[PDB]
Design a protein around this ligand. Structure first.
Ligand SMILES: [N+]
Length: 115
């Protein structure tokens, strides 16, 4: 019903950094999963990372991407983040079992689980 971030799994970026990078991509989304990332990532005490103007790109049902502080940050299916250059990690998927995957440049950075 109401998606909430429950777990951030990391295989370098911390759990909170992954949330903040993904939220920068997802900042203006109306999609409930993206809004859940944004909510979880709010940090009133931090200099908010922002996507570069005009770089947000999305293919509905597959994922989104933007440049955040000079990094290509992807948020979406495993196929989406691999297509954008991340190398796979079978353990990350197994550790996770909705879910989204996070790529940062050529790195598969994280998986986020929602309940
Ligand atoms: N970061």
């Amino acid at each position: 019903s109401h998606p909430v971030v429950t777990e951030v799994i990391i295989p370098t970026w911390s759990e909170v950094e992954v949330l903040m990078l993904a939220a920068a991509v997802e900042s203006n989304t109306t999609h409930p999963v993206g809004k859940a990332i944004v909510k979880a990532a709010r940090a009133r005490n931090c200099q908010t990372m922002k996507a570069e103007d005009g770089t947000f790109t999305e293919e509905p049902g597959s994922g989104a991407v933007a440049i955040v502080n000079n990094k290509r940050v992807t948020v979406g299916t495993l196929e989406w983040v691999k297509r954008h250059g991340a190398t796979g990690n079978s353990l990350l998927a197994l550790a996770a079992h909705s879910v989204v995957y996070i790529g940062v440049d050529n790195t598969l950075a994280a998986v986020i689980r929602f309940e």
